[PDB]
Design a protein around this ligand. Structure first.
Ligand SMILES: NC(=O)c1ccc[n+]([C@@H]2O[C@H](COP(=O)([O-])OP(=O)(O)OC[C@H]3O[C@@H](n4cnc5c(N)ncnc54)[C@H](OP(=O)(O)O)[C@@H]3O)[C@@H](O)[C@H]2O)c1
Ligand SMILES: C[C@]12CCC(=O)C[C@H]1CC[C@@H]1[C@@H]2CC[C@]2(C)[C@@H](O)CC[C@@H]12
Ligand SMILES: [Cl-]
Length: 325
């Protein structure tokens, strides 16, 4: 059972993961310096013990600053904090995996990360640009070799630089490539994908559960709805009539309802907020439960439409979203 003080759930490698974490992606341009550090500190003060981040979010040094400050003052021990980092598309070449993880460790100034995941199954041209596009606009797709990339990840765990290994934005067959790998040492313990009531991931969740893989729900609140990259065709998730009606019943916000929905069914949620009140609000989800009837009803909101389509990359051979799941 889950509580504010104790809400870690088992991973297949004997480790465990806090079922709620703080997401840390924020638009580099429109975000004040220090905002991420401040939020991570508030989150830890609030009770979060899981932070989701990525070097390419450009604020990993702020995440590290915050975690180390809280450890230094004795708010938490290192082992009490769960940090997930991500290997980006430009860094899939096996020889680059360990140096890329080591960079993140040096940025955080920590000895290990709790979880390290392949960010997308698509490889891009290695280089100083995380989004490689030629003069004419065309994205530069390096050939993907997921099993080889995974082998390089496994070696990182063998070296003790990371406790658990996972993936993100992987479809069922991409998960199969790895699960069926000849001589596999460490299976993925987690797949981080878009998940929330408008895109509930019914099949992928069942598939993962059968293979003892935990789903981490990114954009669990339906995203910030930034037009530049979000599919704003769907109505804003938080304005949903049913989610709002249930909020009233429990004296909770729509956001609190949607978070409770996913964690109640064993899905890890990583809502992002850099706002003091909302950081606290998102954590207050252990003092009520939804009925099965309500869960069913929230499930039924599924639109099978993604806020996060990444269409500009739909031409890459490993684009994950062509398949049904
Ligand atoms: N693996 C991947 O490919 C991938 C992709 C996307 C995201 N992620 C991860 O998942 C994290 C969360 O997903 P996300 O950032 O895209 O979107 P999200 O967590 O679903 O929602 C973020 C938006 O909701 C607002 N918000 C937060 N709490 C709220 C509340 N209680 N009421 C109303 N609004 C609220 C935030 O604004 P404020 O900050 O002002 O509160 C922000 O604009 C990301 O930060 C990142 O760590 C991973
Ligand atoms: C979706 C997403 C995917 C990759 C990531 O980690 C961040 C996220 C939000 C920012 C997006 C990016 C894909 C590429 C862009 C759409 C860039 O072209 C401008 C903003 C970028
Ligand atoms: Cl990276």
């Amino acid at each position: 059972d889950l509580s504010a003080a104790s809400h870690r759930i088992p991973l297949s490698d004997g480790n465990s993961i806090p079922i709620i974490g703080l997401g840390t992606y924020s638009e580099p341009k429109s975000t004040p310096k220090g905002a991420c550090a401040t939020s991570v500190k508030v989150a830890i003060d609030t009770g979060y013990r899981h932070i989701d981040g990525a070097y390419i979010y450009q604020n990993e040094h702020e995440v590290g600053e915050a975690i180390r400050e809280k450890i230094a003052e004795g708010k938490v021990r290192r082992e009490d904090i769960f940090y997930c980092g991500k290997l980006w598309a430009t860094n899939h070449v096996p020889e680059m995996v360990r140096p890329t993880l080591e960079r993140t460790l040096r940025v955080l100034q920590l000895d290990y990360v709790d979880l390290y995941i392949i960010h997308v199954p698509m490889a891009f041209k290695p280089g100083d640009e995380i989004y490689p596009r030629d003069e004419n606009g065309k994205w530069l797709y390096h050939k993907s070799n997921l099993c080889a990339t995974w082998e390089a990840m496994e070696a990182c765990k063998d070296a003790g630089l990371v406790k658990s290994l996972g993936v993100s934005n992987f479809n069922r067959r991409q998960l199969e490539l790895i699960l069926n790998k000849p001589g596999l040492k460490h299976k993925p313990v987690s797949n981080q994908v878009e998940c929330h009531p408008y895109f509930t991931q019914p099949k992928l969740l069942k598939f993962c559960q059968q293979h003892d893989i935990v789903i981490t729900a990114y954009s669990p609140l339906g995203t910030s709805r930034n037009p530049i990259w979000v599919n704003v065709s769907s109505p804003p998730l938080l304005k949903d009539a049913l989610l709002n009606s249930l909020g009233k019943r429990y004296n909770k916000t729509a956001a609190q309802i949607v978070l409770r929905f996913n964690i109640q069914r064993g899905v890890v949620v990583i809502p992002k907020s850099f706002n003091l009140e909302r950081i606290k609000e998102n954590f207050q989800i252990f003092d009520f439960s939804l009925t099965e009837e309500e869960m069913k009803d929230i499930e039924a909101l599924n639109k099978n439409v993604r806020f996060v389509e990444l269409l500009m990359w739909r031409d890459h051979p490993e684009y994950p979203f062509h398949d049904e799941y």
